[PDB]
Amino acid sequence: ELVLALYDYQEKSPDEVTMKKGDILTLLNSTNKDWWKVEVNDRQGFVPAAYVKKLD
């Protein structure tokens, strides 16, 4: 399942990942209402669910 970064997000903790607006990410875990685990290129970690949008 693919998602679109709606906004830039810079990582602020060791479970997080940095993404840039318009980036296309792989949705890994949408279990948490607030933080979704995504893959941005080679790196995986959590971003705000609200800053990404399911395409798929």
Swiss-Prot record:
Question: Source organism's superkingdom?
Answer: Eukaryota
Domain SH3 positions: 1-56
Q: Where in the cell is it found?
A: Cytoplasm, Cytoskeleton; Cytoplasm, Cell cortex
Q: How does it assemble?
A: Like erythrocyte spectrin, the spectrin-like proteins are capable of forming dimers which can further associate to tetramers. Interacts with ACP1.
Functionally, this protein is described as follows: Morphologically, spectrin-like proteins appear to be related to spectrin, showing a flexible rod-like structure. They can bind actin but seem to differ in their calmodulin-binding activity. In nonerythroid tissues, spectrins, in association with some other proteins, may play an important role in membrane organization.
Record family assignment: Belongs to the spectrin family.
Question: What is the name attached to this protein's record?
Answer: Spectrin alpha chain, non-erythrocytic 1
What is the source species?
A: Gallus gallus
Which residues of the whole protein does the chain here span? 970 to 1025 of 2477
